[PDB]
Amino acid sequence: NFTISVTTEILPVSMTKTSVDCTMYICGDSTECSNLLLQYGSFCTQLKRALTGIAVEQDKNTQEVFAQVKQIYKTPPIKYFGGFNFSQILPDPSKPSKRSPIEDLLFNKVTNGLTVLPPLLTDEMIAQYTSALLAGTITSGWTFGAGPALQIPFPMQMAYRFNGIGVTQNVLYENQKLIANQFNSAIGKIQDSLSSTPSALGKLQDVVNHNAQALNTLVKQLSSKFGAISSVLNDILSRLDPPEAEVQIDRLITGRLQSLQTYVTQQLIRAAEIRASANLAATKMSECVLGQSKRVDFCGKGYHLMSFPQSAPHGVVFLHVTYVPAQEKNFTTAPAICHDGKAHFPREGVFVSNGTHWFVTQRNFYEPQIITTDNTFVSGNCDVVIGIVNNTVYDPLQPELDS
Amino acid sequence: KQLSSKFGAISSVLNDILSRLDPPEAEVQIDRLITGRLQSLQTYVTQQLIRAAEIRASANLAATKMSECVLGQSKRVDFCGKGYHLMSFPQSAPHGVVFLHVTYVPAQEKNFTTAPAICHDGKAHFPREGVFVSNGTHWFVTQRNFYEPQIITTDNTFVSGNCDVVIGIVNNTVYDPLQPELDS
Amino acid sequence: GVNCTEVNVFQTRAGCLIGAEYVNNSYECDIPIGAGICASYQSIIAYTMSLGAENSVAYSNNSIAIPT
Numbered sequence A: 001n002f003t004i005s006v007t008t009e010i011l012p013v014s015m016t017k018t019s020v021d022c023t024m025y026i027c028g029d030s031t032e033c034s035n036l037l038l039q040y041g042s043f044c045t046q047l048k049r050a051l052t053g054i055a056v057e058q059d060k061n062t063q064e065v066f067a068q069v070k071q072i073y074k075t076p077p078i079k080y081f082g083g084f085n086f087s088q089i090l091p092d093p094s095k096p097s098k099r100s101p102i103e104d105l106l107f108n109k110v111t112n113g114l115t116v117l118p119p120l121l122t123d124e125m126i127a128q129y130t131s132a133l134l135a136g137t138i139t140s141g142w143t144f145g146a147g148p149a150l151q152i153p154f155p156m157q158m159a160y161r162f163n164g165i166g167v168t169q170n171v172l173y174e175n176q177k178l179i180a181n182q183f184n185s186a187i188g189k190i191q192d193s194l195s196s197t198p199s200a201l202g203k204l205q206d207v208v209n210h211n212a213q214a215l216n217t218l219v220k221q222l223s224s225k226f227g228a229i230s231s232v233l234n235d236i237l238s239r240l241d242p243p244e245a246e247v248q249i250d251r252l253i254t255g256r257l258q259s260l261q262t263y264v265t266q267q268l269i270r271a272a273e274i275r276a277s278a279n280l281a282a283t284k285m286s287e288c289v290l291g292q293s294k295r296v297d298f299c300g301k302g303y304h305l306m307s308f309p310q311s312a313p314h315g316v317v318f319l320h321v322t323y324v325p326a327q328e329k330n331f332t333t334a335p336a337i338c339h340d341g342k343a344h345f346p347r348e349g350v351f352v353s354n355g356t357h358w359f360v361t362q363r364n365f366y367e368p369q370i371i372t373t374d375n376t377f378v379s380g381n382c383d384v385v386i387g388i389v390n391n392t393v394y395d396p397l398q399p400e401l402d403s
Numbered sequence B: 001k002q003l004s005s006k007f008g009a010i011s012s013v014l015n016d017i018l019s020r021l022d023p024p025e026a027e028v029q030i031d032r033l034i035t036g037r038l039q040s041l042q043t044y045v046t047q048q049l050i051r052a053a054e055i056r057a058s059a060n061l062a063a064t065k066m067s068e069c070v071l072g073q074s075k076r077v078d079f080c081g082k083g084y085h086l087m088s089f090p091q092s093a094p095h096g097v098v099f100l101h102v103t104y105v106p107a108q109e110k111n112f113t114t115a116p117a118i119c120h121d122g123k124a125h126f127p128r129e130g131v132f133v134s135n136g137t138h139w140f141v142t143q144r145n146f147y148e149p150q151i152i153t154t155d156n157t158f159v160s161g162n163c164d165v166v167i168g169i170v171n172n173t174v175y176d177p178l179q180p181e182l183d184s
Numbered sequence C: 001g002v003n004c005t006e007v008n009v010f011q012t013r014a015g016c017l018i019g020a021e022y023v024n025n026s027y028e029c030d031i032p033i034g035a036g037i038c039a040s041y042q043s044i045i046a047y048t049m050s051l052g053a054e055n056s057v058a059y060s061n062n063s064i065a066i067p068t
């Protein structure tokens, strides 16, 4: 017996683009500031170029994380996919933001001189992209990211997904109602669990607290004396004698440039971390979503079947579907079957015996069948296999050649 | 370019300051110049190491793609080329590498009518590797990526269960070669 | 990020845009700006970015497609 469960993992994608006013954050409204800053060679073009390159990198990350398709697929008007409830995943046009209830729930759960640039892609086209990807993965199967899309019905697609993990497709059609009920119950349980657990959403919130703290600590360091006479431009450039006030403001802007270059260092380290996370997210997007990935752990605890991504603020959230078997049963096996001096070997499974009778079964499910020659192949003789047992094999079409 | 920066001093030439002013102050001018150049080279080192970080990230990705797709056939979808993976080839590049992916794009499609199983003699029939495809009148089994229809045979179909548990089944005959083989 | 009420002019959700008219039609994005705004030289016009062709695919309970 097998239990279908859904697991959720989240991956951050990108952060808000940042642009800093360089000479305004250093010191503003002063000609002495200008003529002492222009003679430092260049401490500002490098930071401006690096920050713009980081912003371009975040925009590019938003590009290849979410836009893997050049077509915008639309869902069919029929809501009956075979008894399977695709209502908490597929977006509905009744909502003003055109978002799924899961996406709306996670969005509601998710809560000078510095300028924060708006992203190129806001929430609405990301939601449209998620709708297009879910349409491609539901009504077109997995044969849409490799060439043109094809009309694929849902149940035989699910049978193909079971066939990809070494399980015969006949087990689906005798238990389709149970699979549909289990998948709907898992969807309901995970929809309740996304809102019940408060600590299922951390890194994204943590990393945005990192961004907010790094933004606030720059202004916090803007109001420090830096070992000078004062920390205010109009108090240090009017009361003091410019023979020493030039040195005082030089030390102050030196401390300020050290502070902002330290902030730029933390920003580039965090941007490299975000870029690596977005690259791994793009790998997950290409493998776990656009097709079936057979490697374990890579797409869900257990055997991977498919996944459904949803739009998230400054990130992406995955909804894996895993094939987890259960209800173990002890049996007695044998490496080969001895018959008429020659050994028999299984083609697709293993010889399984409960008592005094032997049957052949598939690897991941119990389906006892009579041992015949159409699913066995002979090799060698019955003198070398260690642990072989004596048992007759059914010869096919027997009562047929004499009738 | 940072050599021609005054750094708040009188000039940016070491021989000019040392041969025009007294040592005491000259000490302050050289100290300011050397700490400015030290901060400049530290910034350059930081930039060099962050480009080193992105470059060995890209080099590890390129080595993974060289070992996987290049050395062997990759079954990962949309990993080396847009489409099904056939072959790829490495080309020598200055300060990099360029791959030559060969893809498999099955275009020019044509849709049909299917069935998950075929009912005959009270038992359901299931294809081992193909899918049941009908063009309106007869029935055929073909590959999942190429339309090469074949007649339904007991040699490429396996039976399991009965006709009532499975839904969506259709009624059709199955070709068993032993019936024209026995009478001959 | 400047509301230009004190300094053709079309208002985007990124600040002020001066010198680029707004066109209700949509085309493929060439120069990214922000908030779903992309401008290209057709004069210079600003349009909403195009996500692609709406390639809707039919679905039924017994329709399959096999490439030839």
Ligand SMILES: *[C@@H]1O[C@H](CO)[C@@H](O)[C@H](O)[C@H]1NC(C)=O
Pocket (backbone or CB within 6 Å): A001, A002, A175, A178
């Ligand atoms: C597994 O057990 C459940 C009851 O817990 C039952 O409804 C279902 O039909 C069983 N399925 C299999 C594969 O035995």
Ligand SMILES: *[C@@H]1O[C@H](CO)[C@@H](O)[C@H](O)[C@H]1NC(C)=O
Pocket (backbone or CB within 6 Å): A079, A080, A081, A083, A084, A085, A086, A087, A088
């Ligand atoms: C899923 O169940 C809910 C129950 O309210 C229903 O509103 C929704 O239309 C169903 N969706 C599908 C596709 O089954």
Ligand SMILES: *[C@@H]1O[C@H](CO)[C@@H](O)[C@H](O)[C@H]1NC(C)=O
Pocket (backbone or CB within 6 Å): A354, A355, A356, A357, A368
């Ligand atoms: C083992 O299972 C088979 C089929 O399920 C049955 O015929 C046989 O009696 C079983 N053996 C015992 C010892 O119960």
Ligand SMILES: *[C@@H]1O[C@H](CO)[C@@H](O)[C@H](O)[C@H]1NC(C)=O
Pocket (backbone or CB within 6 Å): B135, B136, B137, B138
């Ligand atoms: C379906 O294919 C068979 C075999 O190619 C052919 O005999 C038959 O005429 C075809 N039917 C239609 C409606 O094209």
Ligand SMILES: *[C@@H]1O[C@H](CO)[C@@H](O)[C@H](O)[C@H]1NC(C)=O
Pocket (backbone or CB within 6 Å): C002, C003, C004, C005, C011, C015
């Ligand atoms: C700018 O202010 C004007 C007047 O209040 C208002 O009509 C306009 O919508 C504002 N635009 C922005 C950028 O908020």
Ligand SMILES: *[C@@H]1O[C@H](CO)[C@@H](O)[C@H](O)[C@H]1NC(C)=O
Pocket (backbone or CB within 6 Å): A078, A080, C060, C061, C062
């Ligand atoms: C598929 O089943 C649904 C629900 O019974 C029905 O509304 C729809 O018309 C059916 N379509 C086909 C092609 O049978």
